[PDB]
Design a protein around this motif. Structure first.
Motif, PDB file in Angstrom:
ATOM      1  N   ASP A  58      -3.979   5.347 -13.181  1.00  0.00           N
ATOM      2  CA  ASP A  58      -3.563   3.976 -13.412  1.00  0.00           C
ATOM      3  C   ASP A  58      -2.603   3.566 -12.244  1.00  0.00           C
ATOM      4  O   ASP A  58      -2.475   4.304 -11.244  1.00  0.00           O
ATOM      5  N   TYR A  59      -1.920   2.406 -12.363  1.00  0.00           N
ATOM      6  CA  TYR A  59      -1.032   1.891 -11.318  1.00  0.00           C
ATOM      7  C   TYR A  59       0.433   1.865 -11.787  1.00  0.00           C
ATOM      8  O   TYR A  59       1.260   1.137 -11.229  1.00  0.00           O
ATOM      9  N   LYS A  65      -3.382   3.639  -3.541  1.00  0.00           N
ATOM     10  CA  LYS A  65      -2.619   3.117  -4.684  1.00  0.00           C
ATOM     11  C   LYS A  65      -1.839   1.930  -4.206  1.00  0.00           C
ATOM     12  O   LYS A  65      -1.292   1.964  -3.092  1.00  0.00           O
ATOM     13  N   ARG A  66      -1.827   0.862  -5.018  1.00  0.00           N
ATOM     14  CA  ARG A  66      -1.063  -0.349  -4.680  1.00  0.00           C
ATOM     15  C   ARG A  66       0.098  -0.491  -5.607  1.00  0.00           C
ATOM     16  O   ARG A  66      -0.031  -0.168  -6.800  1.00  0.00           O
ATOM     17  N   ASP A  67       1.209  -1.044  -5.092  1.00  0.00           N
ATOM     18  CA  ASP A  67       2.407  -1.298  -5.892  1.00  0.00           C
ATOM     19  C   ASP A  67       2.344  -2.740  -6.421  1.00  0.00           C
ATOM     20  O   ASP A  67       2.571  -3.675  -5.628  1.00  0.00           O
ATOM     21  N   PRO A  68       2.009  -2.964  -7.719  1.00  0.00           N
ATOM     22  CA  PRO A  68       1.870  -4.349  -8.212  1.00  0.00           C
ATOM     23  C   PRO A  68       3.169  -5.153  -8.273  1.00  0.00           C
ATOM     24  O   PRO A  68       3.115  -6.361  -8.453  1.00  0.00           O
ATOM     25  N   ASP A 128       5.696   6.229 -10.991  1.00  0.00           N
ATOM     26  CA  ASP A 128       5.567   7.695 -10.947  1.00  0.00           C
ATOM     27  C   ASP A 128       6.117   8.432 -12.163  1.00  0.00           C
ATOM     28  O   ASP A 128       5.475   9.384 -12.625  1.00  0.00           O
ATOM     29  N   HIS A 174      -2.408  10.718  -7.408  1.00  0.00           N
ATOM     30  CA  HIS A 174      -3.401   9.668  -7.600  1.00  0.00           C
ATOM     31  C   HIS A 174      -4.464   9.695  -6.465  1.00  0.00           C
ATOM     32  O   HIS A 174      -5.665   9.686  -6.751  1.00  0.00           O
ATOM     33  N   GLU A 175      -4.028   9.795  -5.193  1.00  0.00           N
ATOM     34  CA  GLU A 175      -4.969   9.813  -4.067  1.00  0.00           C
ATOM     35  C   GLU A 175      -5.793  11.063  -4.050  1.00  0.00           C
ATOM     36  O   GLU A 175      -6.992  10.972  -3.753  1.00  0.00           O
ATOM     37  N   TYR A 235       8.483   4.815  -6.924  1.00  0.00           N
ATOM     38  CA  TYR A 235       7.376   5.722  -6.586  1.00  0.00           C
ATOM     39  C   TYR A 235       7.966   6.887  -5.784  1.00  0.00           C
ATOM     40  O   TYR A 235       7.708   7.090  -4.590  1.00  0.00           O
ATOM     41  N   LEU A 277       0.820  -1.200   0.000  1.00  0.00           N
ATOM     42  CA  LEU A 277       0.000   0.000   0.000  1.00  0.00           C
ATOM     43  C   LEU A 277       0.864   1.265   0.000  1.00  0.00           C
ATOM     44  O   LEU A 277       1.659   1.500   0.916  1.00  0.00           O
ATOM     45  N   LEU A 278       0.713   2.057  -1.061  1.00  0.00           N
ATOM     46  CA  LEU A 278       1.447   3.308  -1.221  1.00  0.00           C
ATOM     47  C   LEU A 278       0.722   4.478  -0.561  1.00  0.00           C
ATOM     48  O   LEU A 278       1.352   5.464  -0.203  1.00  0.00           O
ATOM     49  N   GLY A 279      -0.605   4.413  -0.499  1.00  0.00           N
ATOM     50  CA  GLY A 279      -1.394   5.491   0.083  1.00  0.00           C
ATOM     51  C   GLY A 279      -2.853   5.175  -0.106  1.00  0.00           C
ATOM     52  O   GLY A 279      -3.176   4.210  -0.814  1.00  0.00           O
TER      53      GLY A 279
END
Ligand SMILES: [Ca+2]
Ligand SMILES: [Ca+2]
Ligand SMILES: [Zn+2]
Lengths: 270, 14
Positions: free
Chosen positions: A228-229, B1-4, A232, A167-168, A159, A123-125
């Motif tokens: 998108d995912y 946001k998830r890091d795949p 950065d 994104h958040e 990232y 989880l990035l945020g």
């Protein structure tokens, strides 16, 4: 043509060790990135494919650190709270309450609260969407992993250009994942017509054009969209349709977030 | 946001 929407911001650093007590310079760099991405001043707009250039949006949304707190006291817009919590939980929202080891939100009708802390695993945020604003006002805002806050500096590749927060903030402003959260199918939607229908999420730094079973011809899917995912450094636009959706939240009569504009100037001037 | 790509570093070792 559009008027600038002004967002007062408070950053709540919640740290369990010295590494997590990130610098003021790191925080200033994140506010800089939000202003670049939401005002189409990001230098990497040079990387947006020419096929999507006429769809790229300038949200004309400005972010400024708050200079007056909810008690009317002077502030630099940064709070720092030591904690015994090692990893915060998105399920508990414990970073958002000082009773649970975090820091209470500042009046979410007037400030964007950005908590910075240690989050778990991939989880990035995370954000809270506008549909929960009436029922969950005290947890509205955004949380960012301290390793992925700001640009360069203490942020960790891939990232490390402050795009987790872009994104958040997009989600906090009602945007949904460009692929429609449908596990790869073509039936989900982000309810934005100018984002091409897309199967699943993208990762890393894809090669353009990238077609899929939903958009099977060039220019393919907009994998460089902030929603998108991807990495950065490989995301570089919002569309004009996404800008329309985000700005609608500040409609002076119906906007869910219209109250934030009333004292935005007063709260961001020392 | 998830890091795949997060678990790659974990899945390629003991
Ligand atoms: Ca779409
Ligand atoms: Ca889809
Ligand atoms: Zn997301």
């Amino acid at each position: 043509p559009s008027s600038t929407i002004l967002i007062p911001v408070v950053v709540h650093v919640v740290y369990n060790n010295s590494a997590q007590n990130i610098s003021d310079a790191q925080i200033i760099s994140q506010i800089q990135v939000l202003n670049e991405d939401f005002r189409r001043m990001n230098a990497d707009q040079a990387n947006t494919p020419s096929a999507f250039a006429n769809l790229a949006g300038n949200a004309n949304i400005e972010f400024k650190l708050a200079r007056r707190d909810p008690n009317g006291n002077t502030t630099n817009g940064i709070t720092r709270t030591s904690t015994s919590t090692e990893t915060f939980s998105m399920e508990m929202d414990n970073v958002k309450f000082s009773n649970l080891g975090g820091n209470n939100a500042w009046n979410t009708r007037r400030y964007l609260n950005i908590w910075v802390c240690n989050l778990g695993d991939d989880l990035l945020g995370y954000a809270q969407f506008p549909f929960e604003f009436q029922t969950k006002p005290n947890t509205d805002g955004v949380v960012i992993h301290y390793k992925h806050f700001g640009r360069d500096g203490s942020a960790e590749s891939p990232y490390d250009k402050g795009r987790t927060a872009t994104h958040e903030v997009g989600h906090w402003l009602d945007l949904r994942h460009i692929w429609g959260d449908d596990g790869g199918s073509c039936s989900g939607t982000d309810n934005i017509a100018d984002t091409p229908n897309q199967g699943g999420y993208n990762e890393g730094c894809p090669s353009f054009p990238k077609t899929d079973h939903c958009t099977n011809t060039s220019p393919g899917v907009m994998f460089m969209n902030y929603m998108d995912y991807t990495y950065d450094a490989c995301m570089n636009l919002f569309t004009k349709g996404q800008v329309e959706r985000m700005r609608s939240l500040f409609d002076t009569q119906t906007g869910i977030r219209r109250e934030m504009q009333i004292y935005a100037n007063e709260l961001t001037n020392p | 946001k998830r890091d795949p790509v997060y678990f790659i570093k974990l899945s390629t070792i003991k």
